[PDB]
């Protein structure tokens, strides 16, 4: 049915129910995609729990669905309706972060690549901007390892003993005692060899004063 | 960094790092809710083998 | 270790590491805290500058 | 920390590391030792071969 | 080394490393310490900044 | 210290590091050997090949 | 290297590195001193500070 309308609150009516049907509502930029590549993107989105709709002003009407319920996803109490020219609306059960990654990694469809750029994503009271959605995975991995090391270092240093820390605690206390004893030149079975090494090197250096 | 310590805590006690568990741990520490940071943390850690990450210890 | 993650979580947000706060965070993670372990940790932490000690190993 | 240096003292001189000997050593140092910390180290040291641990280092 | 552990125990609880303190700790460990071993340690530890040695342990 | 240099002087010359040689060298350097200190060095050296130690010390 | 070890022993115990003291320790180690070597050594060590040499060699 495309001989004519284009009808308002037949198209916006349908889009209405649609937005109310899915937990995750994104605005995407479709302008970079030729018709067939976009068609392939639509198929992919369908196979992954969602769908894409293209329209213009009747898309603005995130308002009628927001009104028909309780939120702040619309025009009204929202931010800066991230809509642009040739924005489409993509409704999905995919988590907003998953959606963003999905769209980034599926430019499908010679080595030219094109896709859908996310403008903003609404879920349960919050609008997610691309800067929030764009996760630095290595940063999270690094921070996780840093936090683990902080806990390990703290526990060892205070001698809080756990299977993870007990051997390092024993070795640290021993190394502390051995290092202090060698520095003080105090003779034990455990320190005599490093001490003789110091004394031998002192002899070697001292001998260097001879002509 | 409270999100990462909350995750490590949960992992160390055999609990799933999900929004509910993360929120409860953070709340108990008097931390105000930040849905975007909670959800981002969960997304970042999805599919991540935490035990492997930890054994690589750097 | 879960007691230490709980302590560093509190510390990251400027919350005091005491028995009450440790117990609250641990219970929120779904565990019954062992009083002796909380007691020992708080004692192990007396006089400790956490910002400094979290930072060296080898 | 003090409990480990006491355990290592005991070990070096061939004494068993437990509650009674650890307590006596710390008291002799002029402090009131924390029972919780003594007990945790004793427990943590079950099955630990201290000589092999030291030799496995530096 | 039994002498050294006695010393570091003292240091870790903020007690002066002198002949008397060393002797008491060692006797509590259940040994009769050699007096010359005790004074040699005290003398050697003179001028040695234990904390700086400990922390800057190359 | 003096017990080590006395020992190394004897080694460099082919003399045994025993109580008699150590005392004799020490006395000749104007110091009164202390038996426990002599014995601690001798015991510390038991089973130690000094040539092999020194080979790796430069 | 016995001449240098002798110098080091004397130094470690605050004795002057002169002809008489070197010969006495060498003699105690069964060494018959060579006057020429004794002279060369004390002359070579005039001015040099042994403390810093010991420190730099460690």
Coordinates of C-alpha atoms in Angstrom, one line a residue:
Chain A
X1 CA 0.0 0.0 0.0
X2 CA 2.2 2.9 -1.4
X3 CA 0.1 4.4 -4.2
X4 CA -0.7 7.1 -1.7
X5 CA -0.4 7.9 2.1
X6 CA 1.6 8.3 4.2
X7 CA -1.4 8.8 6.5
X8 CA -1.0 10.5 9.9
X9 CA -2.1 8.4 12.8
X10 CA -2.2 5.4 10.5
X11 CA 1.6 5.5 10.2
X12 CA 2.0 7.3 13.5
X13 CA -0.7 5.1 15.0
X14 CA 1.2 1.9 14.0
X15 CA 4.6 3.4 15.1
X16 CA 2.8 4.3 18.4
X17 CA 1.8 0.7 19.3
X18 CA 5.3 -0.4 18.1
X19 CA 7.3 1.8 20.5
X20 CA 5.0 0.7 23.4
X21 CA 5.7 -2.9 22.4
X22 CA 9.5 -2.9 23.0
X23 CA 11.7 -2.0 26.0
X24 CA 14.5 -0.4 23.9
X25 CA 13.9 2.4 21.5
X26 CA 16.7 3.8 19.3
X27 CA 17.0 6.6 16.8
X28 CA 19.5 5.7 14.1
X29 CA 20.9 7.5 11.1
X30 CA 20.2 5.5 7.9
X31 CA 21.3 8.1 5.3
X32 CA 24.6 6.4 4.5
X33 CA 23.0 3.1 3.3
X34 CA 21.8 2.4 -0.2
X35 CA 18.5 0.6 -0.5
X36 CA 19.7 -3.0 -0.6
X37 CA 22.4 -2.7 2.1
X38 CA 19.7 -1.1 4.3
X39 CA 17.4 -4.0 3.5
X40 CA 20.1 -6.4 4.6
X41 CA 20.4 -4.4 7.8
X42 CA 16.6 -4.6 8.4
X43 CA 16.8 -8.4 8.0
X44 CA 19.7 -8.7 10.5
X45 CA 17.8 -6.5 13.0
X46 CA 14.7 -8.7 12.7
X47 CA 16.7 -11.9 13.3
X48 CA 18.0 -10.2 16.4
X49 CA 14.8 -9.3 18.3
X50 CA 13.8 -6.0 16.8
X51 CA 12.9 -3.9 13.8
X52 CA 13.5 -0.7 11.9
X53 CA 11.0 2.0 10.7
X54 CA 11.8 4.9 8.5
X55 CA 9.6 8.1 8.5
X56 CA 10.1 11.9 9.1
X57 CA 7.9 14.1 11.2
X58 CA 5.5 11.3 12.1
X59 CA 8.5 9.7 13.9
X60 CA 8.3 12.7 16.2
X61 CA 5.6 11.1 18.2
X62 CA 7.9 9.4 20.6
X63 CA 5.6 12.0 22.2
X64 CA 2.3 10.1 21.7
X65 CA 3.8 6.9 23.1
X66 CA 5.5 8.7 26.0
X67 CA 2.2 10.4 26.7
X68 CA 0.1 7.2 26.4
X69 CA 2.4 6.1 29.3
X70 CA 4.4 7.5 32.2
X71 CA 7.9 8.4 31.1
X72 CA 10.4 11.0 29.8
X73 CA 11.4 9.6 26.4
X74 CA 9.7 12.0 24.1
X75 CA 9.8 15.6 23.1
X76 CA 8.5 16.9 26.4
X77 CA 10.8 16.4 29.5
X78 CA 13.6 14.8 27.4
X79 CA 17.0 16.3 26.4
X80 CA 17.6 17.4 22.8
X81 CA 15.5 15.0 20.6
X82 CA 18.6 13.5 18.9
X83 CA 16.7 13.2 15.6
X84 CA 18.4 14.2 12.4
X85 CA 17.5 14.1 8.7
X86 CA 16.9 10.6 7.6
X87 CA 16.8 9.2 11.1
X88 CA 15.0 5.9 11.5
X89 CA 13.5 4.4 14.6
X90 CA 14.7 1.0 15.7
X91 CA 12.7 -0.8 18.4
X92 CA 14.3 -3.9 20.0
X93 CA 14.6 -6.2 23.0
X94 CA 18.4 -5.9 22.7
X95 CA 20.1 -4.2 25.5
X96 CA 21.2 -0.6 24.4
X97 CA 24.9 -1.5 24.9
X98 CA 24.5 -4.7 22.9
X99 CA 22.6 -2.8 20.2
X100 CA 25.3 -0.2 19.9
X101 CA 28.0 -2.9 19.6
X102 CA 25.9 -4.9 17.2
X103 CA 25.4 -2.0 14.8
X104 CA 29.1 -1.1 15.0
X105 CA 30.2 -4.6 14.1
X106 CA 27.5 -5.4 11.5
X107 CA 28.2 -3.0 8.6
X108 CA 27.1 -5.9 6.4
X109 CA 26.9 -5.2 3.6
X110 CA 34.7 -5.2 -2.4
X111 CA 36.1 -3.7 0.9
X112 CA 33.7 -0.7 1.2
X113 CA 31.7 -0.8 4.5
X114 CA 28.6 1.2 5.5
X115 CA 26.1 1.1 8.4
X116 CA 23.6 2.6 10.8
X117 CA 24.9 5.2 13.3
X118 CA 23.1 5.4 16.6
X119 CA 21.9 8.8 17.6
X120 CA 20.4 8.0 21.0
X121 CA 18.7 5.0 22.8
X122 CA 15.9 5.0 25.3
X123 CA 15.4 2.4 27.9
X124 CA 13.4 2.4 31.2
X125 CA 13.5 6.2 31.9
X126 CA 17.0 6.9 30.5
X127 CA 18.3 8.2 27.2
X128 CA 21.7 6.7 26.3
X129 CA 23.9 8.9 24.1
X130 CA 26.6 7.3 21.8
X131 CA 29.4 8.5 24.1
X132 CA 27.9 6.5 27.0
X133 CA 27.2 3.4 24.8
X134 CA 30.7 3.3 23.3
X135 CA 32.3 1.0 25.9
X136 CA 36.2 0.9 26.1
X137 CA 36.4 -2.8 26.8
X138 CA 40.2 -2.8 27.5
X139 CA 39.7 0.0 30.0
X140 CA 37.2 -2.1 32.0
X141 CA 39.6 -5.1 31.8
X142 CA 42.5 -2.9 33.0
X143 CA 40.5 -1.5 35.8
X144 CA 39.4 -5.0 36.9
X145 CA 43.0 -6.2 37.0
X146 CA 44.0 -3.0 38.8
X147 CA 41.3 -3.5 41.4
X148 CA 42.4 -7.1 41.9
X149 CA 46.0 -6.1 42.3
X150 CA 45.0 -3.3 44.8
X151 CA 43.2 -6.0 46.9
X152 CA 46.1 -8.4 46.6
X153 CA 48.8 -5.8 47.5
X154 CA 46.8 -4.5 50.5
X155 CA 46.1 -7.9 51.9
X156 CA 49.8 -9.0 51.6
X157 CA 51.1 -5.7 52.9
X158 CA 48.9 -5.9 56.0
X159 CA 49.3 -9.7 56.3
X160 CA 45.6 -10.6 55.9
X161 CA 46.1 -14.3 55.2
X162 CA 44.0 -16.1 52.6
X163 CA 44.8 -18.9 50.2
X164 CA 45.5 -16.1 47.6
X165 CA 48.0 -14.2 49.9
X166 CA 49.5 -16.5 52.5
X167 CA 52.6 -17.6 50.5
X168 CA 53.3 -14.0 49.4
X169 CA 53.0 -12.9 53.0
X170 CA 55.5 -15.5 54.3
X171 CA 57.9 -14.6 51.5
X172 CA 57.6 -10.9 52.2
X173 CA 58.2 -11.2 55.9
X174 CA 61.2 -13.5 55.2
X175 CA 62.6 -11.1 52.5
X176 CA 62.1 -8.2 54.9
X177 CA 64.1 -10.0 57.6
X178 CA 66.8 -11.3 55.2
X179 CA 67.2 -7.8 53.6
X180 CA 67.5 -6.0 56.9
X181 CA 70.0 -8.6 58.2
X182 CA 72.3 -8.4 55.1
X183 CA 72.1 -4.6 55.2
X184 CA 73.2 -4.7 58.8
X185 CA 75.9 -7.2 58.1
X186 CA 74.4 -9.7 60.5
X187 CA 75.6 -13.3 60.1
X188 CA 73.1 -16.1 59.7
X189 CA 72.9 -19.2 57.7
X190 CA 70.5 -17.3 55.4
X191 CA 72.5 -14.2 55.0
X192 CA 76.2 -15.3 55.0
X193 CA 76.4 -15.8 51.2
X194 CA 75.1 -12.4 50.2
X195 CA 77.3 -10.9 52.9
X196 CA 80.4 -12.6 51.6
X197 CA 79.5 -11.3 48.2
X198 CA 79.4 -7.7 49.5
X199 CA 82.7 -8.2 51.3
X200 CA 84.3 -9.8 48.2
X201 CA 83.2 -6.9 45.9
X202 CA 84.5 -4.4 48.5
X203 CA 87.9 -6.2 48.3
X204 CA 87.8 -6.0 44.5
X205 CA 86.9 -2.3 44.4
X206 CA 89.5 -1.5 47.2
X207 CA 92.2 -3.4 45.2
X208 CA 91.4 -1.0 42.3
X209 CA 93.2 1.7 44.3
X210 CA 96.5 -0.2 43.9
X211 CA 98.7 0.9 40.9
Chain B
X1 CA 36.5 2.2 42.0
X2 CA 33.3 1.0 43.5
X3 CA 31.8 -0.6 40.4
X4 CA 34.8 -2.8 39.8
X5 CA 35.1 -3.7 43.5
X6 CA 31.4 -4.5 43.6
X7 CA 31.9 -6.9 40.6
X8 CA 35.0 -8.5 42.2
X9 CA 33.1 -8.9 45.5
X10 CA 30.2 -10.6 43.7
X11 CA 32.5 -12.8 41.7
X12 CA 34.4 -13.8 44.8
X13 CA 31.2 -15.0 46.5
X14 CA 29.9 -16.9 43.5
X15 CA 27.2 -14.3 42.7
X16 CA 26.2 -13.2 39.2
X17 CA 27.3 -9.8 38.2
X18 CA 24.0 -8.4 37.2
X19 CA 22.1 -5.2 37.7
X20 CA 20.2 -6.4 40.8
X21 CA 23.2 -7.8 42.7
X22 CA 25.4 -4.8 41.8
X23 CA 22.7 -2.3 42.9
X24 CA 22.2 -4.1 46.3
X25 CA 26.0 -4.1 47.1
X26 CA 26.5 -0.5 46.0
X27 CA 23.3 0.6 48.0
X28 CA 24.7 -1.0 51.1
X29 CA 27.8 1.1 50.7
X30 CA 25.7 4.3 50.5
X31 CA 26.3 4.7 46.8
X32 CA 23.6 6.6 44.9
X33 CA 22.2 4.7 41.8
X34 CA 23.8 5.4 38.4
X35 CA 21.9 3.2 36.0
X36 CA 24.1 4.0 33.0
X37 CA 27.3 3.0 34.9
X38 CA 25.6 -0.1 36.3
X39 CA 24.4 -1.2 32.9
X40 CA 27.7 -0.3 31.2
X41 CA 29.6 -2.4 33.8
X42 CA 27.4 -5.4 33.2
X43 CA 27.7 -5.0 29.4
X44 CA 31.5 -4.7 29.7
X45 CA 31.8 -7.8 31.8
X46 CA 29.4 -10.0 29.6
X47 CA 31.3 -12.9 28.1
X48 CA 34.4 -11.9 30.1
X49 CA 36.2 -14.8 31.8
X50 CA 36.9 -13.0 35.1
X51 CA 39.1 -15.8 36.4
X52 CA 41.3 -15.6 33.3
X53 CA 41.5 -11.8 33.6
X54 CA 42.6 -12.2 37.2
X55 CA 45.2 -14.9 36.6
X56 CA 46.8 -12.5 34.0
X57 CA 47.3 -10.2 37.0
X58 CA 48.3 -6.9 35.4
Chain C
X1 CA 39.1 -12.2 49.2
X2 CA 35.6 -10.9 49.7
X3 CA 36.3 -9.0 53.0
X4 CA 39.1 -7.0 51.3
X5 CA 36.9 -6.2 48.2
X6 CA 34.3 -5.0 50.5
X7 CA 36.8 -2.8 52.4
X8 CA 38.3 -1.3 49.1
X9 CA 34.8 -0.7 47.9
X10 CA 34.0 1.4 51.0
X11 CA 37.3 3.1 50.8
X12 CA 36.8 4.1 47.1
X13 CA 33.7 6.2 48.1
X14 CA 35.2 7.6 51.3
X15 CA 33.2 5.3 53.7
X16 CA 34.7 4.2 56.9
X17 CA 35.9 0.6 57.1
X18 CA 34.3 -0.6 60.3
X19 CA 32.4 -3.7 61.4
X20 CA 29.0 -2.3 60.6
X21 CA 29.8 -1.1 57.1
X22 CA 31.7 -4.3 56.2
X23 CA 28.8 -6.4 57.4
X24 CA 26.2 -4.4 55.5
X25 CA 28.2 -4.7 52.2
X26 CA 28.8 -8.5 52.7
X27 CA 25.2 -9.2 53.5
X28 CA 24.1 -7.3 50.5
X29 CA 26.3 -9.6 48.4
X30 CA 24.3 -12.5 49.9
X31 CA 26.7 -13.8 52.5
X32 CA 26.6 -14.2 56.2
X33 CA 29.7 -12.4 57.4
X34 CA 32.1 -14.2 59.7
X35 CA 32.6 -11.9 62.7
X36 CA 36.2 -13.1 63.3
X37 CA 37.2 -12.3 59.7
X38 CA 35.7 -8.8 59.9
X39 CA 37.3 -8.3 63.3
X40 CA 40.7 -9.5 62.0
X41 CA 40.6 -7.3 58.9
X42 CA 39.7 -4.1 60.9
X43 CA 42.6 -4.8 63.2
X44 CA 45.0 -5.6 60.3
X45 CA 44.0 -2.2 58.9
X46 CA 44.7 0.0 62.0
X47 CA 47.3 2.6 61.2
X48 CA 47.4 1.6 57.6
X49 CA 47.5 4.2 54.8
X50 CA 45.4 2.4 52.2
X51 CA 46.2 4.8 49.4
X52 CA 49.9 3.9 49.7
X53 CA 49.8 0.1 50.3
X54 CA 47.5 -0.7 47.4
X55 CA 50.3 0.3 45.1
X56 CA 53.4 -2.1 45.5
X57 CA 54.2 -5.8 44.8
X58 CA 56.7 -7.5 42.5
Chain D
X1 CA 53.1 -7.7 60.4
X2 CA 53.8 -8.9 63.9
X3 CA 51.9 -12.2 63.8
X4 CA 53.9 -13.5 60.8
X5 CA 57.3 -12.4 62.4
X6 CA 56.2 -14.3 65.5
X7 CA 55.2 -17.4 63.4
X8 CA 58.6 -17.2 61.6
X9 CA 60.4 -16.9 64.9
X10 CA 58.6 -20.0 66.3
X11 CA 59.4 -21.9 63.0
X12 CA 63.1 -20.9 63.0
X13 CA 63.5 -22.2 66.5
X14 CA 61.5 -25.4 65.8
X15 CA 58.4 -24.6 67.8
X16 CA 54.8 -25.4 66.7
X17 CA 52.9 -22.4 65.4
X18 CA 49.7 -22.1 67.2
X19 CA 47.4 -20.0 69.4
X20 CA 49.3 -20.6 72.7
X21 CA 52.9 -20.1 71.4
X22 CA 51.9 -17.1 69.2
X23 CA 50.1 -15.5 72.1
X24 CA 53.1 -15.9 74.5
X25 CA 55.6 -14.4 72.0
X26 CA 53.4 -11.3 71.2
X27 CA 52.7 -10.7 74.9
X28 CA 56.5 -10.9 75.5
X29 CA 56.9 -8.1 72.9
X30 CA 54.7 -5.9 75.2
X31 CA 51.4 -5.9 73.2
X32 CA 48.0 -7.4 73.8
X33 CA 47.6 -9.5 70.7
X34 CA 44.4 -9.7 68.7
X35 CA 43.0 -13.3 69.1
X36 CA 41.2 -13.0 65.8
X37 CA 44.5 -12.4 63.9
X38 CA 46.3 -15.2 65.8
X39 CA 43.6 -17.6 64.9
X40 CA 43.4 -16.6 61.2
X41 CA 47.1 -17.0 60.7
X42 CA 47.1 -20.4 62.5
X43 CA 44.2 -21.5 60.3
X44 CA 45.8 -20.1 57.1
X45 CA 49.0 -21.9 57.9
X46 CA 47.4 -25.4 58.1
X47 CA 49.2 -27.6 55.5
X48 CA 51.5 -24.7 54.5
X49 CA 55.2 -25.9 54.2
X50 CA 57.0 -22.7 55.3
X51 CA 60.5 -23.8 54.2
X52 CA 59.3 -24.8 50.7
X53 CA 57.4 -21.4 50.5
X54 CA 60.6 -19.5 51.4
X55 CA 62.8 -21.5 49.1
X56 CA 60.3 -21.1 46.2
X57 CA 61.2 -17.3 46.3
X58 CA 64.0 -14.9 45.4
Chain E
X1 CA 67.5 -15.4 61.9
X2 CA 65.6 -16.2 65.1
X3 CA 67.3 -13.1 66.4
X4 CA 66.3 -11.1 63.3
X5 CA 62.6 -12.2 63.5
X6 CA 62.6 -11.2 67.2
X7 CA 63.9 -7.7 66.1
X8 CA 61.4 -7.2 63.3
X9 CA 58.6 -8.3 65.6
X10 CA 59.7 -5.6 68.0
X11 CA 59.9 -3.0 65.2
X12 CA 56.5 -4.0 63.8
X13 CA 54.8 -3.3 67.2
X14 CA 56.8 -0.1 67.7
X15 CA 59.0 -1.4 70.5
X16 CA 62.7 -0.5 70.8
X17 CA 65.1 -3.1 69.6
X18 CA 67.4 -3.4 72.6
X19 CA 69.0 -6.3 74.5
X20 CA 66.1 -6.6 77.1
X21 CA 63.2 -6.6 74.7
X22 CA 65.0 -9.1 72.3
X23 CA 65.8 -11.5 75.2
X24 CA 62.2 -11.6 76.5
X25 CA 60.7 -12.3 73.1
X26 CA 63.3 -15.1 72.5
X27 CA 62.7 -16.7 75.9
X28 CA 58.9 -16.6 75.2
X29 CA 59.7 -18.4 72.0
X30 CA 61.1 -21.0 74.4
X31 CA 64.8 -20.6 73.6
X32 CA 67.7 -19.4 75.8
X33 CA 69.2 -16.8 73.5
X34 CA 73.0 -16.2 73.2
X35 CA 73.7 -12.8 74.8
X36 CA 76.5 -12.0 72.3
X37 CA 74.2 -12.8 69.4
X38 CA 71.7 -10.4 70.9
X39 CA 74.1 -7.5 71.4
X40 CA 75.7 -8.0 68.0
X41 CA 72.3 -7.6 66.4
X42 CA 71.5 -4.4 68.4
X43 CA 74.9 -3.0 67.3
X44 CA 74.5 -3.9 63.7
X45 CA 71.0 -2.4 63.6
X46 CA 72.5 1.0 64.6
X47 CA 72.3 3.4 61.7
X48 CA 70.0 1.0 59.8
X49 CA 66.7 2.6 58.9
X50 CA 64.5 -0.6 58.9
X51 CA 61.5 1.0 57.3
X52 CA 63.6 2.5 54.4
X53 CA 65.4 -0.8 54.0
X54 CA 62.0 -2.7 54.0
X55 CA 60.2 -0.4 51.5
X56 CA 63.1 0.2 49.1
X57 CA 63.9 -3.5 49.1
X58 CA 65.7 -3.6 45.6
Chain F
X1 CA 82.1 -7.0 59.6
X2 CA 85.2 -8.3 61.1
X3 CA 84.3 -12.0 61.4
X4 CA 83.6 -12.1 57.6
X5 CA 86.8 -10.3 56.6
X6 CA 88.7 -12.6 59.0
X7 CA 87.1 -15.6 57.3
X8 CA 87.8 -14.3 53.8
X9 CA 91.4 -13.5 54.7
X10 CA 91.9 -17.1 55.8
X11 CA 90.2 -18.5 52.7
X12 CA 92.3 -16.3 50.3
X13 CA 95.3 -18.0 51.9
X14 CA 94.1 -21.6 52.0
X15 CA 93.7 -21.7 55.8
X16 CA 90.6 -23.5 57.3
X17 CA 87.9 -21.2 58.7
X18 CA 87.8 -22.8 62.1
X19 CA 87.5 -21.5 65.7
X20 CA 91.3 -21.3 66.2
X21 CA 92.3 -19.5 63.0
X22 CA 89.4 -17.1 63.3
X23 CA 90.2 -16.2 66.9
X24 CA 93.9 -15.8 66.1
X25 CA 93.2 -13.5 63.2
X26 CA 90.6 -11.5 65.2
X27 CA 93.0 -11.2 68.3
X28 CA 95.8 -10.0 66.0
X29 CA 93.4 -7.3 64.7
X30 CA 93.0 -6.1 68.3
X31 CA 89.6 -7.6 69.1
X32 CA 88.3 -10.1 71.6
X33 CA 86.4 -12.9 69.8
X34 CA 83.1 -13.9 71.3
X35 CA 82.5 -17.7 71.2
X36 CA 78.9 -17.5 70.2
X37 CA 79.7 -15.2 67.3
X38 CA 82.6 -17.5 66.2
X39 CA 80.2 -20.5 66.4
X40 CA 77.4 -18.6 64.5
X41 CA 79.8 -17.9 61.6
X42 CA 81.2 -21.5 61.5
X43 CA 77.6 -22.9 61.5
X44 CA 76.5 -20.4 58.9
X45 CA 79.3 -21.7 56.7
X46 CA 78.7 -25.4 57.2
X47 CA 78.3 -27.0 53.7
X48 CA 79.0 -23.8 52.0
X49 CA 81.6 -23.8 49.2
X50 CA 83.1 -20.2 49.4
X51 CA 84.9 -20.5 46.0
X52 CA 81.5 -21.2 44.4
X53 CA 79.8 -18.4 46.2
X54 CA 82.5 -15.9 45.3
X55 CA 82.5 -17.0 41.6
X56 CA 79.1 -15.6 41.3
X57 CA 79.6 -12.4 43.4
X58 CA 81.8 -10.0 41.3
Chain G
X1 CA 94.2 -10.6 48.1
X2 CA 95.0 -11.2 51.8
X3 CA 96.7 -7.8 52.0
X4 CA 93.5 -6.1 51.0
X5 CA 91.3 -8.4 53.2
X6 CA 93.7 -7.4 56.0
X7 CA 93.2 -3.7 55.3
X8 CA 89.4 -4.4 55.3
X9 CA 89.4 -6.2 58.6
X10 CA 91.4 -3.5 60.3
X11 CA 89.0 -0.8 58.9
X12 CA 85.9 -2.8 60.0
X13 CA 87.0 -2.5 63.5
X14 CA 88.4 1.0 63.5
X15 CA 92.1 0.1 63.6
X16 CA 94.6 2.2 61.5
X17 CA 96.0 0.7 58.3
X18 CA 99.7 0.9 59.1
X19 CA 102.6 -1.4 58.8
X20 CA 102.5 -2.9 62.3
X21 CA 98.8 -3.8 62.2
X22 CA 98.8 -5.3 58.7
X23 CA 101.8 -7.5 59.6
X24 CA 100.2 -8.7 62.8
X25 CA 97.0 -9.9 61.1
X26 CA 98.9 -11.3 58.1
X27 CA 101.2 -13.2 60.5
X28 CA 98.2 -14.6 62.3
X29 CA 97.0 -16.0 58.9
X30 CA 100.4 -17.8 58.5
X31 CA 101.5 -15.2 55.9
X32 CA 105.1 -13.9 56.0
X33 CA 104.5 -10.2 55.0
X34 CA 106.5 -8.7 52.1
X35 CA 107.6 -5.3 53.2
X36 CA 107.4 -3.9 49.7
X37 CA 103.8 -5.1 49.4
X38 CA 102.9 -3.7 52.9
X39 CA 104.4 -0.3 51.9
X40 CA 102.6 -0.2 48.5
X41 CA 99.3 -1.0 50.2
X42 CA 99.3 1.6 53.0
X43 CA 100.7 4.2 50.6
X44 CA 97.9 3.3 48.0
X45 CA 95.2 3.6 50.8
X46 CA 96.4 7.0 52.1
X47 CA 93.5 9.4 51.4
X48 CA 91.1 6.9 49.9
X49 CA 87.9 6.5 51.9
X50 CA 87.1 2.8 52.6
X51 CA 83.5 3.6 53.8
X52 CA 82.4 4.8 50.4
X53 CA 84.3 1.9 48.6
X54 CA 82.4 -0.6 50.8
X55 CA 79.1 1.2 50.0
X56 CA 79.7 1.3 46.2
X57 CA 80.7 -2.3 46.0
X58 CA 77.5 -3.5 47.7

